[PDB]
Amino acid sequence: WVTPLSKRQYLLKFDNRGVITNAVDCSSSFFSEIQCKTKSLLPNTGVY
Amino acid sequence: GYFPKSGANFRDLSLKGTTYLSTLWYQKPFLSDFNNGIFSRVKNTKLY
Amino acid sequence: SEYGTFCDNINSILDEVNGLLDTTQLHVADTLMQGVTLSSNLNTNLHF
Amino acid sequence: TGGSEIRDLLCVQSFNGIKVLPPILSESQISGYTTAATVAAMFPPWSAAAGIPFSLNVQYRINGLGVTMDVLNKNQKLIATAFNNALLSIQNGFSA
Amino acid sequence: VGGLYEIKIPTNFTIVGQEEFIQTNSPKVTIDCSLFVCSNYAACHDLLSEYGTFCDNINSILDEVNGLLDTTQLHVADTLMQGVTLSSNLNTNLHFDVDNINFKSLVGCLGPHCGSSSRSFFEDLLFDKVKLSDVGFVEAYNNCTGGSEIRDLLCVQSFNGIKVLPPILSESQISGYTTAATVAAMFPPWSAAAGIPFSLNVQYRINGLGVTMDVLNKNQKLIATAFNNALLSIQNGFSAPNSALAKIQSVVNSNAQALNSLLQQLFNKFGAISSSLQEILSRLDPPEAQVQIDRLINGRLTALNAYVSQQLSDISLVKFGAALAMEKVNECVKSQSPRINFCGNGNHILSLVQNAPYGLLFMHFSYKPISFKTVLVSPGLCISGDVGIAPKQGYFIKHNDHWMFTGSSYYYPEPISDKNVVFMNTCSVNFTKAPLVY
Amino acid sequence: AQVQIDRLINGRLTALNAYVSQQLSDISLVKFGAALAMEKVNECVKSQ
Amino acid sequence: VYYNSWQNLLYDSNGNIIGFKDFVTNKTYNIFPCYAGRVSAAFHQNASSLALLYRNLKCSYVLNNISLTTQPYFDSYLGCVFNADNLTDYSVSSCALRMGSGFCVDYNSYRFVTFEPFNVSFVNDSIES
Numbered sequence: 001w002v003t004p005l006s007k008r009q010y011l012l013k014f015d016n017r018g019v020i021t022n023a024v025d026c027s028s029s030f031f032s033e034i035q036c037k038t039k040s041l042l043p044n045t046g047v048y
Numbered sequence: 049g050y051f052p053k054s055g056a057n058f059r060d061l062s063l064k065g066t067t068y069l070s071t072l073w074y075q076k077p078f079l080s081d082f083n084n085g086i087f088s089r090v091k092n093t094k095l096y
Numbered sequence: 097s098e099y100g101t102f103c104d105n106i107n108s109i110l111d112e113v114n115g116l117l118d119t120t121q122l123h124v125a126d127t128l129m130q131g132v133t134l135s136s137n138l139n140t141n142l143h144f
Numbered sequence: 145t146g147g148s149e150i151r152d153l154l155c156v157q158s159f160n161g162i163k164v165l166p167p168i169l170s171e172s173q174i175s176g177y178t179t180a181a182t183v184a185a186m187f188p189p190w191s192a193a194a195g196i197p198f199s200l201n202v203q204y205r206i207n208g209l210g211v212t213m214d215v216l217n218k219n220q221k222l223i224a225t226a227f228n229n230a231l232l233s234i235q236n237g238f239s240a
Numbered sequence: 241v242g243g244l245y246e247i248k249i250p251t252n253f254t255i256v257g258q259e260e261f262i263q264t265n266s267p268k269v270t271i272d273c274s275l276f277v278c279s280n281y282a283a284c285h286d287l288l289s290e291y292g293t294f295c296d297n298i299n300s301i302l303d304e305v306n307g308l309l310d311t312t313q314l315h316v317a318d319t320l321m322q323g324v325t326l327s328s329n330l331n332t333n334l335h336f337d338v339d340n341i342n343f344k345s346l347v348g349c350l351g352p353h354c355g356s357s358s359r360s361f362f363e364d365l366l367f368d369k370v371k372l373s374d375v376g377f378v379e380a381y382n383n384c385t386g387g388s389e390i391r392d393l394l395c396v397q398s399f400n401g402i403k404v405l406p407p408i409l410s411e412s413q414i415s416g417y418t419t420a421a422t423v424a425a426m427f428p429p430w431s432a433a434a435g436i437p438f439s440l441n442v443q444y445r446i447n448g449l450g451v452t453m454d455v456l457n458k459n460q461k462l463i464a465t466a467f468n469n470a471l472l473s474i475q476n477g478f479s480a481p482n483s484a485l486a487k488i489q490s491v492v493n494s495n496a497q498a499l500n501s502l503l504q505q506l507f508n509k510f511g512a513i514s515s516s517l518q519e520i521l522s523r524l525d526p527p528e529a530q531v532q533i534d535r536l537i538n539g540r541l542t543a544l545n546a547y548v549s550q551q552l553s554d555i556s557l558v559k560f561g562a563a564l565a566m567e568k569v570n571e572c573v574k575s576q577s578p579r580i581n582f583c584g585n586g587n588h589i590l591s592l593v594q595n596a597p598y599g600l601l602f603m604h605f606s607y608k609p610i611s612f613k614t615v616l617v618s619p620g621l622c623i624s625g626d627v628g629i630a631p632k633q634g635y636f637i638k639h640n641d642h643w644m645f646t647g648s649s650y651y652y653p654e655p656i657s658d659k660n661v662v663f664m665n666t667c668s669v670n671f672t673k674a675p676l677v678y
Numbered sequence: 679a680q681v682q683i684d685r686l687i688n689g690r691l692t693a694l695n696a697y698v699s700q701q702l703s704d705i706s707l708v709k710f711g712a713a714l715a716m717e718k719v720n721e722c723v724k725s726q
Numbered sequence: 727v728y729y730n731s732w733q734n735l736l737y738d739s740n741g742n743i744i745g746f747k748d749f750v751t752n753k754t755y756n757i758f759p760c761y762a763g764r765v766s767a768a769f770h771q772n773a774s775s776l777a778l779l780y781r782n783l784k785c786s787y788v789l790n791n792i793s794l795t796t797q798p799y800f801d802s803y804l805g806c807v808f809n810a811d812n813l814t815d816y817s818v819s820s821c822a823l824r825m826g827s828g829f830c831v832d833y834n835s836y837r838f839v840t841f842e843p844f845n846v847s848f849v850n851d852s853i854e855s
């Protein structure tokens with residue numbers, strides 16, 4: 001399986017042992033934008 | 049960084065033959081533009 | 097983007113201000129409705 | 145987005161990221177609450193008028209200023225007419 | 241129908257308690273502008289000195305703001321202590337309940353022999369749910385040189401010149417003042433309770449709502465038990481998602497958020513090659529390092545001016561809140577002003593005050609109807625020689641085919657008399673005719 | 679273009695901070711006005 | 727335990743270095759900032775010296791790691807106090823040099839004393855009927 005790379009901004013989450021457990025492509029979707037704005041994988045309940 | 053676009057597609061570019069080679073296998077869309085780069089997900093085919 | 101948190105601060109202060117207005121409008125409406133008891137027979141098309 | 149030839153400044157402000165949002169309660173809801181608070185003085189249980197008829201509340205309030213009860217309960221029609229004339233004077237005074 | 245209207249009059253009642261936190265204070269933030277803008281770097285302190293008074297202006301505004309908070313805290317404490325007279329025989333280790341009403345949880349240690357233990361059980365229960373009170377900040381900063389592997393943001397803020405100072409009066413002193421103001425209603429001379437026993441003051445306040453004294457002075461045990469049950473319900477209510485406790489935590493959270501945003505301003509580049517003075521001064525010589533450092537100085541000084549302008553705006557709201565809290569101490573706790581919804585919602589009986597992190601917590605007690613009777617009432621009667629009578633805090637009712645009075649807040653038919661009547665030399669129209677009365 | 683755009687960014691961010699500081703000041707007066715209006719509803723309309 | 731074979735530096739969310747592994751010895755260290763802070767100096771116009779408060783610092787830390795001085799010192803609730811007599815048992819009803827938490831500096835030398843601006847009025851009457 002092959003997909004193109006490009007220069008993009010990601011949110012990255014590192015666990016307590018330094019493994020990347022999750023990531024978010026900030027411009028990929030509206031929910032991805034809320035996640036990057038709040039720097040969290042599960043944003044608080046609210047209107048953004 | 050150089051990351052995939054989330055929600056874009058991977059293409060499965062692997063080809064398996066037995067005896068004959070198709071001349072279409074050595075043209076677009078298989079022969080592909082590199083641009084900035086590529087991300088690959090590769091199945092390790094564990095034979096016995 | 098190299099000015100970082102400046103736009104985040106502007107958005108955060110305006111969201112606080114607008115939340116103060118919303119909370120104030122609720123407290124005014126609560127003050128108007130406090131203790132109001134009406135008859136279910138009341139119909140302002142005939143009683144005025 | 146109506147396609148009009150009119151160049152409203154509110155549209156130009158909104159396209160430059162400046163926009164006024166509506167309040168969480170509409171002015172129609174608030175006018176419902178002020179209507180309810182007003183009729184709460186008209187009819188029993190008179191919950192906004194100290195638990196008595198509005199005309200008696202008006203009469204007792206005027207009496208509290210140092211006006212004898214005798215002229216108030218004798219002139220009740222004149223007092224009610226003065227009251228609703230004052231209300232009409234406020235409404236008409238918005239046209240000035 | 242005829243001269244009478246249908247009204248629901250209460251036939252039974254209880255006392256309900258409602259909490260109200262009012263903010264009267266805020267964390268005293270102090271900034272060292274020189275340490276915040278330039279850290280330890282001499283090449284930056286040189287350039288910052290060519291900006292002249294900007295750090296002097298930032299320090300002067302924050303010193304004025306913090307002086308306004310200090311003056312406000314003194315005026316609140318003065319308001320709590322105003323007029324309070326206590327017996328020197330009073331000992332809260334033995335004297336904690338009167339007339340079947342229990343105040344043990346609202347009263348701390350009284351007098352200096354017990355030290356800083358003057359916080360009440362109620363105030364203890366309220367303070368234990370808020371980490372960053374005044375003593376909370378003092379302990380957090382005490383731990384910054386403890387060598388702990390825990391990287392507290394309060395330590396990082398303080399090392400960047402952002403620190404919260406303690407208030408001029410400790411919360412333990414304020415808790416002593418709220419304790420003294422509470423016991424001033426409990427025992428003679430009753431200096432906070434109009435000079436009469438607390439239970440009689442409660443009884444007269446309920447009677448003032450239109451409840452006959454005859455039910456009150458026979459139900460005195462039921463009223464006292466309703467009162468202390470309401471107080472227990474207020475205490476238990478802090479274990480739930482309480483709106484007063486939420487408001488108190490929001491004071492700490494909004495402060496911690498503002499300080500955190502001000503610290504994050506150090507890491508912005510403001511269009512310079514880096515946000516670190518260490519990196520600039522290890523990459524460039526003075527002629528170009530000056531150009532980069534000057535961008536950081538303008539960015540950081542702009543962030544301080546923005547934070548100062550927000551702080552001035554917020555402390556205006558803190559002064560407004562403290563002025564309201566002093567007005568409630570005067571007109572709800574120390575006395576009962578004739579203002580309907582001022583001391584909380586509904587039929588307000590009486591109010592009490594306890595200390596709280598950055599404010600005061602008021603308990604408002606209200607007369608709450610439990611059940612109702614629909615009855616036919618007359619707002620007035622025309623009697624004898626067309627003399628008019630109107631009821632005081634009540635209604636005229638037909639009972640047993642006889643005209644009788646009842647209080648408006650509790651259904652209890654009692655005989656009509658000059659004690660419960662307003663006379664008029666002429667009866668109004670639509671007063672019910674009753675020639676047989678008096 | 680960076681040197682010019684950075685002057686526009688500083689001008690526009692300075693204008694937003696000024697407008698924010700004015701808005702906070704005005705909303706303090708709106709809260710004061712609403713507190714007075716609730717006091718008049720309670721002490722003039724619902725009671726005397 | 728978190729350093730893999732290609733990794734030697736530990737970073738925080740802001741991009742400060744907060745730890746490292748030494749390339750030669752493979753030993754691992756956390757990095758902490760050196761202490762920084764102000765001195766709260768109380769001054770009276772009738773005095774020849776300052777009373778100094780090192781907020782939240784114990785006097786052993788001030789003397790060992792910041793500076794030695796000839797002045798007398800003690801550990802108050804607020805931190806190490808220099809050139810003032812510990813008199814928190816004493817109390818004053820007015821104070822020009824307010825330090826916080828009901829503590830005041832007073833000047834005759836300097837004294838460190840409690841600030842108690844308000845009193846209850848006391849009467850010796852019986853509480854009981």
Ligand SMILES: *[C@@H]1O[C@H](CO)[C@@H](O[C@@H]2O[C@H](CO)[C@@H](O[C@@H]3O[C@H](CO)[C@@H](O)[C@H](O)[C@@H]3O)[C@H](O)[C@H]2NC(C)=O)[C@H](O)[C@H]1NC(C)=O
Binds near residue numbers: 460
């Ligand atoms: C009227 O005067 C009497 C006598 O001075 C007062 O009675 C006393 O009231 C207290 C409650 O405030 C009673 O305390 C109770 O003691 C029992 C243990 O005996 C305990 O289980 C209860 O929880 C409560 O603490 C006290 O016993 C009682 N003393 C007497 C001799 O009756 C009364 O409070 C005064 N006021 C009124 C409105 O009656």
Ligand SMILES: *[C@@H]1O[C@H](CO)[C@@H](O[C@@H]2O[C@H](CO)[C@@H](O)[C@H](O)[C@H]2NC(C)=O)[C@H](O)[C@H]1NC(C)=O
Binds near residue numbers: 750751752
């Ligand atoms: C420090 O750690 C490095 C990395 O593990 C050690 O270097 C490796 O040592 C093993 C065993 O001798 C070799 O098989 C590897 O080829 C070495 N190199 C690498 C890049 O892995 C090194 O010996 C350690 N030194 C000390 C003093 O502890």
Ligand SMILES: *[C@@H]1O[C@H](CO)[C@@H](O[C@@H]2O[C@H](CO)[C@@H](O)[C@H](O)[C@H]2NC(C)=O)[C@H](O)[C@H]1NC(C)=O
Binds near residue numbers: 802813815
């Ligand atoms: C500062 O002075 C105060 C007041 O004299 C000291 O506090 C007393 O200390 C003794 C011994 O621990 C206790 O028995 C007293 O009960 C304390 N009184 C109070 C009001 O707390 C304090 O220990 C002194 N501190 C230093 C470092 O000198």
Ligand SMILES: *[C@@H]1O[C@H](CO)[C@@H](O)[C@H](O)[C@H]1NC(C)=O
Binds near residue numbers: 251253610
């Ligand atoms: C009033 O209500 C309480 C609680 O429901 C009840 O215990 C009491 O018996 C009631 N009294 C009357 C007179 O209804």
Ligand SMILES: *[C@@H]1O[C@H](CO)[C@@H](O)[C@H](O)[C@H]1NC(C)=O
Binds near residue numbers: 376380388
């Ligand atoms: C301060 O440090 C001590 C010892 O590590 C610890 O017991 C205490 O809970 C800490 N308090 C705070 C607020 O960090």
Ligand SMILES: *[C@@H]1O[C@H](CO)[C@@H](O)[C@H](O)[C@H]1NC(C)=O
Binds near residue numbers: 819843844845
């Ligand atoms: C307060 O009480 C103490 C102890 O009796 C006394 O020393 C002090 O002078 C009093 N101050 C005031 C203002 O009453």
Ligand SMILES: *[C@@H]1O[C@H](CO)[C@@H](O)[C@H](O)[C@H]1NC(C)=O
Binds near residue numbers: 850
């Ligand atoms: C109360 O104080 C006064 C004045 O010192 C004194 O005359 C009186 O005897 C005292 N009474 C008691 C019970 O201490």
